[PDB]
UniProtKB/Swiss-Prot annotation, chain C:
Lineage: Eukaryota, Fungi, Dikarya, Ascomycota, Saccharomycotina
Protein name: 26S proteasome regulatory subunit RPN6
PTM comment text: N-acetylated by NAT1.
Additional note from the record: Present with 16800 molecules/cell in log phase SD medium.
Subunit structure: Component of the lid subcomplex of the 19S proteasome regulatory particle complex (also named PA700 complex). The 26S proteasome consists of a 20S proteasome core and two 19S regulatory subunits.
Entire-sequence positions represented here: 381 to 434 of 434
Role noted for this protein: Component of the lid subcomplex of the 26S proteasome, a multiprotein complex involved in the ATP-dependent degradation of ubiquitinated proteins. In the complex, RPN6 is required for proteasome assembly.
Record family assignment: Belongs to the proteasome subunit S9 family.
From Swiss-Prot, chain D:
Name listed for the protein in its UniProt record: 26S proteasome regulatory subunit RPN12
Biological process, per Gene Ontology: proteasome-mediated ubiquitin-dependent protein catabolic process; ubiquitin-dependent protein catabolic process
Keyword field contains DNA damage: no
Source organism per UniProt: Saccharomyces cerevisiae (strain ATCC 204508 / S288c)
Start and end residues of each PCI domain: 1-156
Full protein: residues contained: 96 to 272 of 274
Gene name, Swiss-Prot/TrEMBL: RPN12
Curated annotation (Swiss-Prot), chain E:
Upper classification of the organism: Eukaryota, Fungi, Dikarya, Ascomycota, Saccharomycotina
Protein's name according to its UniProt entry: 26S proteasome regulatory subunit 8 homolog
Subunit text: May form a homodimer or a heterodimer with a related family member. Interacts with OLA1, TMA17, and UBR1.
Residues with N-acetylthreonine modification: 2
Post-translational modification (record): N-acetylated by NAT1.
Species, as recorded: Saccharomyces cerevisiae (strain ATCC 204508 / S288c)
Comment field (misc): Present with 4700 molecules/cell in log phase SD medium.
Annotated family: Belongs to the AAA ATPase family.
UniProtKB/Swiss-Prot annotation, chain H:
Gene Ontology BP term (one): regulation of cell cycle
One Pfam family this sequence matches: DSS1_SEM1
Transcription among keywords: yes
Reported phenotype of the disruption mutant: Impairs mRNA export and transcription elongation, and induces strong transcription-associated hyperrecombination phenotypes.
Domain of life: Eukaryota
Subunit-level organization: Part of the 26S proteasome. Associates with the nuclear pore complex (NPC)-associated TREX-2 complex and the COP9 signalosome. Interacts with CSN12 and THP3.
Miscellaneous notes: Present with 5590 molecules/cell in log phase SD medium.
Modified residues (Phosphoserine): 12
Function: Versatile protein that might stabilize multiple protein complexes involved in diverse pathways. Subunit of the 26S proteasome which plays a role in ubiquitin-dependent proteolysis. Also associates with the TREX-2 complex that is required for transcription-coupled mRNA export, and the COP9 signalosome, which is involved in deneddylation.
Keywords per UniProt: Acetylation, Phosphoprotein, Proteasome, Transcription
Protein name: 26S proteasome complex subunit SEM1
InterPro entries hit by this protein: DSS1_SEM1
One Gene Ontology CC term in the entry: proteasome storage granule
Organism listed in the record: Saccharomyces cerevisiae (strain ATCC 204508 / S288c) (Baker's yeast)
Length: 475, 50, 54, 177, 51, 71, 405, 89, 96
């Protein structure tokens, strides 16, 4: 019954044990171990649930414990204290094996290679708490222990790969609690949460590991977005240390999403385009990822429009995400037609939805874009029309009103016209040719540089598998 | 310069196409290496024996 | 005009007929559009050999 | 202790101060910080003022922007110390626009736009902004081109323009490497 | 693996633990060269083998 | 929190106000270094003054900021 | 065979709220009668589902509500008797007979052909899945190329019947390869008329047109809609695609069109619209347009959905043709010729300027319409950078996925 | 839903450990649920069931005719309104 | 050294060019010709279904390669247009 479940689970865990321990004891294999860990972890959290929830505890029982028995005993007891051979060090099935922690060696404290394993065991635990939503006290306790525990280590490269994943849950559980409900407790721990990440990021530069570094920059840029401190995000960007050397595709993808947000609130749109497109491309196109793509697609509307290019009607039409991007389709149509009344109506009705995604603050600014388009339309159609007629059409207040919109539009050059107040009409000064400008030179430069970029990327990549098959014996 | 870009885009297909063909050669070389690995399993028993 | 006999536009209001010679097109660009089309077919096809890989 | 009436009071003044430097970047940064707890808690009830104003400046709807100053009278205490700074700036933004929009205008129509109640105060702002009114007509055909040139003269990105010659070379080495 | 649960003579034990990866960091910035070396030497060598 | 109030308190005339402000910075010199980089010439200014008596901490605060940047 | 297309046309109209009551119910009688008669009763389960909250929506297998104007959605026990009666006789006969053709001693003639025989009965009653299975068995075994293409057309037709396009789409792409293997110019023609219809359903008139001129001369109707219908379809596609002179050759001087005359309400109106574009008649262009919307586009099952796109395009075409010919025009002048007011004209013009077909600015001071022309070498330049930009996206994304491997 | 052997189908993709990494990590921004959160709340539009899916998410390519919702009634009324004045002159 | 130099009006020639009528002609000929081998090029990659490099070349005539003739013709017109822009752009600003 209960005894059965423990042995069956523990065996499954031993298999996984073997694979990872061989790597670290045969010197770091760097990229390779990160790949192995994720796949094992997906399998393992799912396992944890069935055949008792003491699956994690079994593994701790048949291995040495520098500090792992203490944590496992705290967790168990909380979730109703239970005795079934579940007090670590109870059952013995190591039997003098270096692998499964030699009997003799431990007493003396001759072997102390548990550390990395400890990171991984905690790592499963953080994730199981999250799936359950029994985060709460259990999660806070793990977090407590684990901060002095990393500072007790003088870390190695393999262990940094694992702690880059611990760090993901540590940020998040604080967010989870704060996001339930504002608590006086939540405030105190935010300031704490910021400090510790900062501090650890300085150490992780020196040890020289990409994963710990990239991950920490990402968590901290997201911390900045919630608190409205754009300035602290800017100085942070300006640090410059964000590497590209071995960083996962998960970390880059999140990286670019944040960049898009940070530039747009401080009134730069140019550079936000490149990243909002990049961020869709690095992210994969699965259903479990669909949510992230819904976030990107909402942002893509604001960013694009403020720069002064209309994003595809098509892109939002022919998605499955069309219902999420239903209020947003209605933003795009309002701008297109130039109708003020339409845009105002949209943002009133859907206001509650828009606030969650944090697109709403960007929408106050998108008001400005609606108006310029309405007068842009009139200028293309009509070369000479009296500003009297322009007032009627877009339902503006006076003759002074109509002048001051059009006057600003031409400073930025968007309408490109000339106002005549003593000949009583606006006359378009549109040249509207770019084939007898030095402009095409400037476009073609980007296209050519991108193309060569790819020719090199084919060349470099091509060789590495060829080399490996050559090492292996074949005819 | 337009023609240089359009001509260069042709060359972007050429270079990329070849990439797939090498990974085909790598694919074949692992089956061949497997047959070798089987022959070499047998060879090791001879070594012990003799 | 529409039958393309003399290739001009008749200015109604000033009672003039502007006569123009044959509109030119950059033959070089026109052939560039024919090339681009072919290239788009070919890359779908690249991808089809490139899914046997995985 | 995050609630006081002077909290709303001061928030409004800080923001007025960001507009009056004429850097809307420091404004939007502050605005994202204010929009959570603080803005909802105190509600808008003097917050309404610096936010609507700022908006009327993105638009180029100075008729609304100039109007807001006047409604400042009703809450008068120390909002006057920013309103004076804001007028000269509101007038400045218009003058920037007027250059490119058109090139010459009668004296009465310039007065109307830059907001003065006397024709003479219009010509005084002319001389400060270095623009000649002669025979009651402004000219930008000379002036606009002059000011842009002295400013546009720089020796740190004017030796970087990216030559045609340079672009040909740059392509060239990418093919054989 | 290093410990810092217990310390003795006013963090003497862990003062020494802190400065041993910092001595070896000099050697690790030189190892980042040798780690791009492995990839580029095998790259141009296979290139030399087809020629 | 933000360390910007502490930098603002540097500007005030009494020596007493500034010495206390620099100590507060030190609690979170690697832990909240972002603002200090930007307003760094003030801390240096306080080192260069020979009438300032907490020169020694101003040099340290600076030292730390350059360590965090990568410099 | 023949019953399958003609019932579905009429049934679609039963769905429409765009046709008049009179018309809708003229159709509704034809539907119900020929389903009970030929045993299309399995399809009738589908069709109730298809009407459902447009017009028709009181049912004994779907939504109960009184905003139905149709009784020809509603089930009957007369219908249920019909189902059962016919099904059991026919089926019983045909299963035992077929089985023996395959049973006895001959697998290249008799076994292949028997599967066609199952297939006729499934195709008759409109069950798609079970028609796809049997006719798979015939194709799989080895037979004439001609039979292989012919069998496959029937499967395609079942998609066209259901008003589902993805199903057609899968079928005719396969067939297309087998055409040059048989070397049959007869069944290339029969292929063309099918592909015509497929291109027509989706928005792509460009291919439709090339094929539809071909379908006037040659086709023999094999589970497809009349030659009156096809002739009408050729007219509509003709205006859209082809310039003035090609409009003249291919439509007006077509021996095929000339020899079929105008014998239906829809052909009568469309032939009138072709002539007036060509004649630089402008008065009768707007009247002819309203009549073609009602009497051509709406009664279609393929240009009822493209109605909005089509009417927007011709409106843009007529304005374009006059401007292409005229350096200056007056708003009053242009508007008299068309038969609309000056005000009504100005709107429609200013709507279409940003869409870059018209290429004209319009002054309100003097009321003159100046005609600019920025399309030339400059035009071809915008297209190239845009398509090239897209191509670049494709190269990086396919590339990066493989390099990882 | 599998067709042929499973050999061809292991040769056309083996799932990546890289994708596993991307998916879970993104989920933190996606909150507790944000994959079905929006179409749960809005009830997938409050409108008639009908039988077409060419209003939104059409099979054929999206061309702009969202501008006018029906310019055919409008063009009718315009023509008829001039019609009167003309005739009665 | 005498033997290595073979020209003396090499300096003059490197800053001359032809008439620009035949340059435009080469650019058109190049683009139009690459369409015609691009058509074949699509057909070629329909195949590549026959085991062994040699078998492919013998059986489906893999030697008459469309691949080879596109790459080479693209290369030729491409390299030429780099030089053409380079020469002409030097000439206007240097001389004047």
């Amino acid at each position: 019954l209960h005894h059965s479940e423990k042995k069956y689970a523990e065996e499954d865990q031993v298999q996984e044990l073997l694979k990872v321990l061989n790597e670290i004891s045969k010197t770091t294999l760097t990229l390779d171990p990160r790949y192995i860990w994720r796949s094992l972890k997906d399998l393992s959290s799912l396992r944890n649930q069935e055949l008792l929830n003491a699956e994690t505890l079994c593994f701790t029982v048949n291995v040495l414990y520098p500090d792992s028995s203490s944590f496992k005993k705290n967790l168990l007891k909380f979730i109703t204290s239970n005795h079934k051979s579940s007090v670590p060090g109870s059952a013995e099935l190591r039997n003098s094996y270096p692998a499964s922690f030699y009997s003799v060696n431990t007493e003396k404290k001759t072997i102390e290679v548990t550390a990395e394993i400890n990171c991984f065991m905690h790592l499963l635990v953080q994730l199981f708490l999250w799936d359950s939503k029994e985060l709460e006290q259990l999660v806070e306790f793990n977090r407590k222990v684990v901060i002095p525990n990393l500072l007790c280590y003088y870390n190695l490269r393999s262990l940094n790969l694992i702690n880059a994943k611990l760090w993901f849950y540590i940020y998040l559980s604080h967010e989870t609690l704060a996001r339930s409900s504002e608590e006086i407790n939540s405030d105190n721990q935010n300031i704490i949460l910021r400090s510790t990440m900062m501090k650890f990021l300085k150490i992780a530069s020196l040890k020289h590991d990409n994963e710990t570094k990239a991950m920490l920059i990402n968590l901290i840029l997201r911390d900045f977005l919630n608190n409205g401190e754009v300035d602290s995000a800017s100085d942070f960007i300006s640090k410059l240390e964000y590497p590209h050397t071995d960083v996962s595709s998960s970390l880059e993808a999140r990286y670019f999403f944040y960049l898009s947000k940070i530039n747009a609130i401080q009134l730069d749109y140019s550079t936000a385009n490149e990243y909002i497109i990049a961020a869709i491309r690095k992210a994969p196109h699965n259903s479990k990822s669909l949510g992230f793509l819904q976030q990107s697609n909402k942002l893509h509307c604001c960013i694009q429009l403020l720069m002064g290019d209309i994003p595809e009607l098509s892109f939002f039409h022919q998605s499955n995400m069309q219902k999420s991007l239903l209020p947003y389709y209605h933003l795009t149509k309002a701008v297109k037609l130039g109708d003020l009344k339409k845009f105002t109506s949209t943002i009133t009705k859907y206001k509650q939805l828009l606030l969650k995604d944090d697109t709403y603050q960007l929408c106050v600014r998108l008001r400005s874009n609606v108006i310029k388009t309405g007068i842009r339309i009139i200028s293309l159609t009509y070369k000479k029309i009296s500003l009297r007629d322009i007032c009627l059409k877009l339902n503006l207040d006076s003759e002074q009103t109509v002048e001051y919109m059009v006057s600003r539009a031409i400073r930025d050059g968007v309408i490109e016209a000339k106002i005549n107040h003593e000949d009583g009409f606006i006359e378009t000064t549109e040249l509207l040719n770019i084939y007898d400008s030095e402009d095409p030179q400037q476009v073609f430069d980007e296209r050519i540089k991108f193309a060569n970029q790819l020719h090199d990327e084919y060349l470099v990549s091509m060789r590495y598998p060829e080399d490996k098959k050559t090492q292996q014996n074949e005819k | 310069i337009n023609i240089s870009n359009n001509l260069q885009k042709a060359l972007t297909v050429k270079t990329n196409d070849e990439l797939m063909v090498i990974y085909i050669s790598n694919l074949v070389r692992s089956i061949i290496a497997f047959d070798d690995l089987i022959e070499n399993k047998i060879q090791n028993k001879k070594i012990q024996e003799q | 005009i529409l039958d393309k006999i003399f290739y001009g536009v008749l200015d109604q209001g000033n009672g003039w007929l502007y006569v123009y010679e044959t509109p030119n097109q950059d033959a070089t660009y026109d052939s560039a559009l024919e090339l681009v089309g072919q290239l788009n077919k070919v890359v779908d096809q690249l991808f089809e050999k490139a899914s046997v890989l995985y | 202790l995050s609630e006081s009436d002077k909290k709303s009071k001061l928030i409004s003044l800080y923001l007025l101060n960001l507009l009056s430097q004429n850097n809307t970047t420091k404004f939007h940064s502050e605005l994202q910080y204010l929009d959570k707890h603080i803005k909802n808690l105190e509600d808008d009830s003097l917050l309404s003022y610096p936010i609507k104003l700022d908006r009327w400046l993105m638009e180029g709807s100075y008729q609304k922007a100039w109007d807001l100053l006047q409604s400042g009278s009703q809450n008068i205490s120390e909002f006057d110390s920013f309103t004076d700074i804001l007028k000269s700036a509101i007038r400045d933004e218009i003058a920037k626009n007027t250059e490119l929009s058109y090139d010459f205008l009668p004296l009465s129509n310039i007065k109307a736009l830059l907001f003065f109640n006397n024709e003479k105060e219009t010509e005084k702002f002319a001389l400060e902004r270095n623009w000649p009114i002669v025979n009651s007509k402004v000219y930008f055909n000379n002036q606009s081109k002059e000011k842009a040139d002295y400013e546009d003269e720089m020796m740190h990105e004017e030796d970087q323009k990216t030559n045609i010659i340079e672009k040909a070379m740059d392509y060239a080495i990418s093919i054989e490497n | 693996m290093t410990a810092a649960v217990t310390s003795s003579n006013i963090v003497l034990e862990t003062h020494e633990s802190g400065i041993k990866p910092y001595f070896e960091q000099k050697i690790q910035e030189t190892e980042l060269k040798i780690r791009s070396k492995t990839e580029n030497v095998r790259r141009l060598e296979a290139q030399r083998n087809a020629l | 929190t933000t360390a910007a109030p502490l930098l603002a308190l540097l500007r005030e005339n009494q020596d007493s106000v500034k010495t206390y402000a620099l100590e507060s910075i030190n609690n979170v010199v690697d832990q909240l270094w972002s603002e200090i980089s930007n307003e760094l010439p003030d801390i240096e200014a306080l080192y260069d003054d020979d009438t300032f008596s907490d020169r020694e901490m101003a040099a340290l605060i600076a030292s730390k900021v350059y360590y965090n940047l990568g410099e | 065979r023949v019953p399958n297309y003609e019932v579905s046309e009429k049934a679609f109209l039963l769905t429409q709220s765009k046709v008049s009551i009179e018309q809708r119910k003229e159709a509704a009688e034809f539907v119900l009668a020929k389903i009970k008669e030929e045993e299309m009763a399995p399809y009738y389960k589908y069709l109730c589902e298809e009407y459902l909250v447009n017009n028709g929506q009181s049912d004994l297998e779907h939504d109960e509500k009184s905003d139905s104007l149709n009784e020809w959605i509603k089930f009957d026990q007369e219908l249920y008797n019909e189902l059962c009666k016919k099904n059991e006789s026919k089926i019983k006969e045909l299963n035992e007979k077929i089985q023996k053709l395959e049973e006895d001693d001959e697998g290249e003639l008799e076994q292949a052909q028997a599967w066609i025989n199952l297939g006729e009965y499934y195709a008759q009653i409109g069950d798609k899945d079970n028609a796809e299975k049997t006719l798979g068995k015939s194709l799989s075994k080895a037979i004439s190329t001609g039979a292989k293409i012919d069998v496959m057309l029937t499967i395609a037709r079942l998609g066209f019947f259901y008003n589902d396009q993805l199903y057609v789409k899968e079928k005719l792409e396969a067939v297309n390869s087998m055409i040059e293997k048989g070397g049959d110019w007869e069944r290339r023609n029969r292929y063309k008329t099918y592909y015509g219809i497929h291109c027509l359903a989706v928005r792509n008139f460009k291919e439709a047109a090339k094929l539809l001129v071909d379908s006037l001369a040659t086709f023999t109707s094999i589970e497809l809609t009349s030659y009156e219908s096809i002739a009408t379809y050729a007219s509509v596609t003709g205006l859209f695609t082809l310039e003035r002179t090609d409009l003249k050759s291919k439509v007006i001087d077509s021996p095929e069109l000339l020899s079929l005359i105008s014998t239906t309400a829809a052909l009568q109106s469309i032939s009138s619209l072709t002539i007036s574009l060509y004649a630089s008649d402008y008065a009768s262009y707007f009247p002819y347009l309203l009549e073609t919307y009602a009497n051509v586009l709406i009664p279609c099952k393929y240009l009822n959905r493209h109605a909005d796109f089509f009417v927007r395009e011709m409106r843009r075409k007529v304005y374009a043709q006059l401007l292409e010919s005229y350096k200056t025009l007056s708003l009053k002048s242009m508007a008299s010729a068309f038969g609309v007011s000056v005000a009504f004209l100005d709107n429609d013009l200013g709507k279409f300027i940003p869409n870059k077909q018209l290429n004209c600015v319009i002054d309100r001071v003097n009321g003159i319409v100046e005609t600019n022309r920025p399309d030339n070498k400059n035009a071809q330049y915008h297209l190239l950078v845009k398509q090239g930009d897209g191509l670049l996206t494709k190269l990086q994304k396919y590339g990066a996925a493989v390099r990882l491997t | 839903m599998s067709t042929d052997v499973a050999a061809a189908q292991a040769q056309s993709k083996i799932d990546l450990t890289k994708k596993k990494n991307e998916e879970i990590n993104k989920k933190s921004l996606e909150e507790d649920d944000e994959f079905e959160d929006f179409p749960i709340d809005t009830w997938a539009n409050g409108e008639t069931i009908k039988s077409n899916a060419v209003t939104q998410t059409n099979i054929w390519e999206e061309n702009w005719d969202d501008v006018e919702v029906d310019d055919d009634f409008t063009n009718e009324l315009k023509a008829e309104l001039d019609r009167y004045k003309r005739e009665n002159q | 050294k005498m033997l290595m130099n073979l020209h003396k009006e090499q300096w003059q020639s490197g800053l001359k060019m032809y008439d620009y009528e035949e340059k435009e002609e080469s650019n058109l000929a190049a683009t139009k010709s690459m369409v015609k081998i691009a058509e074949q090029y699509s057909k070629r990659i329909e195949e590549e279904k026959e085991l062994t490099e040699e078998e492919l070349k013998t059986r489906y005539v893999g030697r008459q390669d469309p691949k080879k003739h596109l790459s080479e013709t693209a290369d030729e017109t491409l390299e030429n247009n780099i030089v053409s822009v380079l020469t002409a752009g030097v000439n206007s600003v240097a001389i004047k």
